């Protein structure tokens, strides 16, 4: 479908921004720095660009983003077992 050929960057950036907030949560949970939060922005914008290489449906871009958010969400919880045993 031509949606995969036309999807707005403003829509991609709004979805990348939900991933950004979960990576910013790692910088809280591990107690990193403002420059390490700049590395979190770079990690999201590298992921975005590397998912765009494999974008072969809008529903595959959208579900792979959701499943990366699910992996990083689950990693917040993992880093909590490794930090405090909860």
Coordinates of N, CA, C and O in Angstrom, one line a residue:
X1 N 0.8 -1.2 0.0 CA 0.0 0.0 0.0 C 0.9 1.3 0.0 O 1.9 1.3 0.7
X2 N 0.4 2.3 -0.7 CA 1.2 3.6 -0.8 C 1.4 4.3 0.5 O 2.2 5.3 0.5
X3 N 0.8 4.0 1.6 CA 1.1 4.5 2.9 C 2.5 4.3 3.3 O 3.2 5.2 3.7
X4 N 3.1 3.1 3.1 CA 4.5 2.7 3.3 C 5.4 3.6 2.5 O 6.6 3.8 2.8
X5 N 4.9 4.2 1.4 CA 5.7 5.0 0.4 C 5.6 6.5 0.8 O 6.2 7.4 0.2
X6 N 4.7 6.9 1.7 CA 4.3 8.3 2.0 C 4.2 8.7 3.5 O 4.0 9.9 3.8
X7 N 4.5 7.8 4.4 CA 4.3 8.0 5.9 C 5.0 9.3 6.4 O 6.2 9.4 6.2
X8 N 4.4 10.2 7.1 CA 5.0 11.5 7.5 C 6.1 11.3 8.5 O 6.0 10.6 9.5
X9 N 7.2 12.1 8.3 CA 8.2 12.1 9.4 C 7.7 12.7 10.7 O 8.1 12.2 11.7
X10 N 6.7 13.6 10.7 CA 6.1 14.1 11.9 C 5.4 13.0 12.7 O 5.5 12.9 14.0
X11 N 4.8 12.0 12.0 CA 4.3 10.8 12.6 C 5.3 9.8 13.1 O 5.2 9.3 14.3
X12 N 6.4 9.6 12.4 CA 7.6 8.8 12.8 C 8.2 9.4 14.1 O 8.3 8.7 15.1
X13 N 8.5 10.7 14.1 CA 9.0 11.4 15.2 C 8.1 11.3 16.5 O 8.7 11.2 17.6
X14 N 6.8 11.3 16.3 CA 5.9 11.2 17.5 C 5.9 9.8 18.1 O 5.8 9.6 19.3
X15 N 6.1 8.7 17.2 CA 6.3 7.3 17.7 C 7.7 7.0 18.3 O 7.8 6.5 19.3
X16 N 8.8 7.5 17.6 CA 10.1 7.6 18.1 C 10.2 8.3 19.5 O 10.9 7.8 20.4
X17 N 9.4 9.3 19.7 CA 9.3 10.0 21.0 C 8.8 9.1 22.2 O 9.0 9.4 23.3
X18 N 8.0 8.1 21.9 CA 7.6 7.1 23.0 C 8.7 6.1 23.4 O 8.9 5.9 24.6
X19 N 9.5 5.7 22.4 CA 10.8 5.0 22.6 C 11.8 5.9 23.4 O 12.4 5.4 24.4
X20 N 11.9 7.2 23.0 CA 12.8 8.2 23.6 C 12.5 8.2 25.1 O 13.4 8.1 25.9
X21 N 11.2 8.3 25.5 CA 10.8 8.4 26.9 C 11.2 7.2 27.7 O 11.6 7.3 28.9
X22 N 11.2 6.0 27.1 CA 11.6 4.7 27.8 C 13.1 4.7 27.9 O 13.6 4.2 28.9
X23 N 13.9 5.2 26.9 CA 15.4 5.3 27.0 C 15.8 6.3 28.1 O 16.7 6.1 28.9
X24 N 15.1 7.4 28.1 CA 15.2 8.5 29.2 C 15.0 7.9 30.6 O 15.6 8.3 31.5
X25 N 14.0 7.0 30.7 CA 13.8 6.2 31.9 C 15.0 5.3 32.3 O 15.2 5.1 33.5
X26 N 15.7 4.7 31.4 CA 17.0 4.0 31.7 C 18.0 4.9 32.3 O 18.7 4.6 33.2
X27 N 18.1 6.2 31.8 CA 19.0 7.2 32.3 C 18.7 7.6 33.7 O 19.6 8.0 34.5
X28 N 17.4 7.6 34.1 CA 16.9 7.7 35.5 C 17.3 6.5 36.3 O 18.0 6.6 37.3
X29 N 16.9 5.3 35.9 CA 17.0 4.0 36.7 C 18.5 3.6 36.9 O 18.8 3.1 38.0
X30 N 19.4 3.9 35.9 CA 20.9 3.6 36.1 C 21.6 4.8 36.6 O 22.8 4.7 36.9
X31 N 21.0 6.0 36.8 CA 21.5 7.3 37.3 C 22.7 7.8 36.5 O 23.7 8.1 37.0
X32 N 22.5 7.9 35.2 CA 23.4 8.6 34.2 C 23.3 10.1 34.2 O 22.6 10.8 35.0
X33 N 24.0 10.7 33.2 CA 24.2 12.1 33.0 C 23.4 12.7 31.8 O 22.9 12.0 30.9
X34 N 23.3 14.0 31.7 CA 22.7 14.8 30.6 C 23.3 14.4 29.2 O 22.6 14.3 28.2
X35 N 24.6 14.2 29.1 CA 25.3 13.7 27.9 C 24.9 12.3 27.5 O 24.8 11.9 26.4
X36 N 24.7 11.4 28.5 CA 24.2 10.1 28.4 C 22.7 10.1 27.9 O 22.3 9.3 27.1
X37 N 21.9 11.1 28.3 CA 20.6 11.4 27.8 C 20.6 11.9 26.3 O 19.8 11.5 25.5
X38 N 21.7 12.6 25.9 CA 22.0 12.9 24.5 C 22.3 11.6 23.7 O 21.8 11.5 22.6
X39 N 23.1 10.7 24.3 CA 23.3 9.4 23.7 C 21.9 8.6 23.5 O 21.7 7.9 22.5
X40 N 21.0 8.7 24.5 CA 19.7 8.1 24.3 C 18.9 8.7 23.1 O 18.3 7.9 22.4
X41 N 19.0 10.0 22.9 CA 18.4 10.6 21.7 C 19.0 10.0 20.4 O 18.3 9.7 19.4
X42 N 20.4 9.9 20.4 CA 21.1 9.3 19.2 C 20.8 7.8 19.0 O 20.7 7.4 17.8
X43 N 20.5 7.1 20.1 CA 20.1 5.6 20.0 C 18.7 5.5 19.3 O 18.6 4.7 18.4
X44 N 17.8 6.3 19.7 CA 16.5 6.4 19.1 C 16.5 6.8 17.6 O 16.0 6.1 16.7
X45 N 17.3 7.8 17.3 CA 17.5 8.3 15.9 C 18.3 7.4 15.0 O 18.2 7.4 13.8
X46 N 19.2 6.6 15.6 CA 19.8 5.5 14.8 C 18.9 4.3 14.6 O 18.9 3.7 13.5
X47 N 18.1 3.9 15.6 CA 17.1 2.9 15.5 C 16.0 3.2 14.4 O 15.7 2.4 13.6
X48 N 15.5 4.5 14.4 CA 14.6 5.0 13.5 C 15.0 4.8 12.0 O 14.4 4.1 11.2
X49 N 16.2 5.3 11.8 CA 16.9 5.2 10.5 C 17.2 3.7 10.0 O 17.2 3.4 8.8
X50 N 17.5 2.8 11.0 CA 17.8 1.4 10.7 C 16.5 0.6 10.6 O 16.5 -0.4 9.8
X51 N 15.4 1.0 11.2 CA 14.1 0.4 10.9 C 13.6 0.9 9.5 O 12.9 0.1 8.8
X52 N 13.8 2.2 9.1 CA 13.5 2.7 7.8 C 14.1 1.9 6.7 O 13.5 1.7 5.6
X53 N 15.3 1.3 6.9 CA 15.9 0.3 5.9 C 15.1 -1.0 5.7 O 15.3 -1.5 4.6
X54 N 14.3 -1.4 6.6 CA 13.5 -2.6 6.6 C 11.9 -2.4 6.6 O 11.2 -3.3 6.8
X55 N 11.5 -1.2 6.4 CA 10.1 -0.6 6.4 C 9.0 -1.2 5.6 O 8.0 -0.5 5.3
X56 N 9.1 -2.4 5.1 CA 8.3 -3.0 3.9 C 6.8 -3.0 4.1 O 6.1 -3.3 3.1
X57 N 6.2 -2.7 5.2 CA 4.9 -2.2 5.4 C 4.8 -1.2 6.5 O 5.6 -1.3 7.5
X58 N 3.8 -0.3 6.5 CA 3.6 0.7 7.6 C 3.2 -0.1 8.9 O 3.7 0.2 10.0
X59 N 2.5 -1.2 8.8 CA 2.2 -2.1 9.9 C 3.4 -2.9 10.4 O 3.5 -3.2 11.6
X60 N 4.4 -3.1 9.6 CA 5.7 -3.7 10.0 C 6.6 -2.7 10.7 O 7.2 -3.0 11.8
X61 N 6.7 -1.5 10.2 CA 7.3 -0.3 10.9 C 6.7 -0.1 12.3 O 7.3 -0.1 13.3
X62 N 5.3 0.1 12.3 CA 4.6 0.3 13.5 C 4.7 -0.8 14.6 O 4.9 -0.5 15.7
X63 N 4.5 -2.1 14.1 CA 4.6 -3.2 15.1 C 6.0 -3.5 15.6 O 6.2 -3.7 16.7
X64 N 7.0 -3.3 14.7 CA 8.4 -3.4 15.1 C 8.9 -2.4 16.1 O 9.5 -2.7 17.1
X65 N 8.4 -1.1 15.9 CA 8.5 0.0 16.9 C 7.9 -0.4 18.2 O 8.5 -0.3 19.3
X66 N 6.6 -0.9 18.2 CA 5.9 -1.3 19.4 C 6.6 -2.5 20.1 O 6.8 -2.4 21.3
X67 N 7.2 -3.4 19.4 CA 7.9 -4.6 19.9 C 9.3 -4.2 20.4 O 9.8 -4.8 21.4
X68 N 9.9 -3.1 19.9 CA 11.2 -2.5 20.5 C 10.9 -1.8 21.8 O 11.6 -1.9 22.7
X69 N 9.8 -1.0 21.8 CA 9.3 -0.4 23.0 C 9.0 -1.5 24.1 O 9.4 -1.3 25.2
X70 N 8.4 -2.6 23.8 CA 8.1 -3.7 24.6 C 9.4 -4.4 25.2 O 9.5 -4.7 26.4
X71 N 10.4 -4.5 24.4 CA 11.8 -5.0 24.8 C 12.5 -4.0 25.7 O 13.1 -4.5 26.7
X72 N 12.4 -2.7 25.5 CA 13.0 -1.7 26.3 C 12.2 -1.5 27.6 O 12.8 -1.4 28.7
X73 N 10.9 -1.5 27.6 CA 10.0 -1.6 28.7 C 10.4 -2.7 29.7 O 10.6 -2.5 30.8
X74 N 10.5 -3.9 29.1 CA 10.9 -5.1 29.8 C 12.3 -5.0 30.4 O 12.6 -5.4 31.5
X75 N 13.2 -4.3 29.7 CA 14.5 -4.0 30.1 C 14.6 -3.0 31.3 O 15.4 -3.3 32.2
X76 N 13.7 -2.0 31.4 CA 13.5 -1.2 32.7 C 13.4 -2.1 33.9 O 14.0 -1.9 34.9
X77 N 12.5 -3.1 33.8 CA 12.2 -4.1 34.8 C 13.3 -5.0 35.2 O 13.6 -5.3 36.3
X78 N 14.1 -5.4 34.2 CA 15.3 -6.2 34.3 C 16.4 -5.5 35.0 O 16.9 -5.9 36.0
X79 N 16.7 -4.3 34.6 CA 17.6 -3.3 35.2 C 17.2 -3.0 36.7 O 18.1 -2.6 37.5
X80 N 15.9 -3.2 37.0 CA 15.4 -3.1 38.4 C 15.8 -4.3 39.3 O 16.2 -4.1 40.4
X81 N 15.7 -5.5 38.7 CA 16.1 -6.7 39.4 C 17.6 -6.7 39.7 O 18.0 -7.0 40.8
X82 N 18.4 -6.3 38.7 CA 19.8 -6.1 38.8 C 20.3 -4.9 39.6 O 21.4 -4.9 40.0
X83 N 19.4 -4.0 40.0 CA 19.7 -2.8 40.8 C 19.2 -2.9 42.3 O 20.0 -2.6 43.2
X84 N 18.0 -3.5 42.5 CA 17.4 -3.5 43.8 C 16.7 -4.9 44.1 O 16.2 -5.0 45.3
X85 N 16.6 -5.8 43.2 CA 16.0 -7.1 43.5 C 14.4 -7.1 43.5 O 13.8 -8.0 44.2
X86 N 13.8 -6.1 42.9 CA 12.3 -6.0 42.8 C 11.7 -6.4 41.5 O 11.7 -5.5 40.6

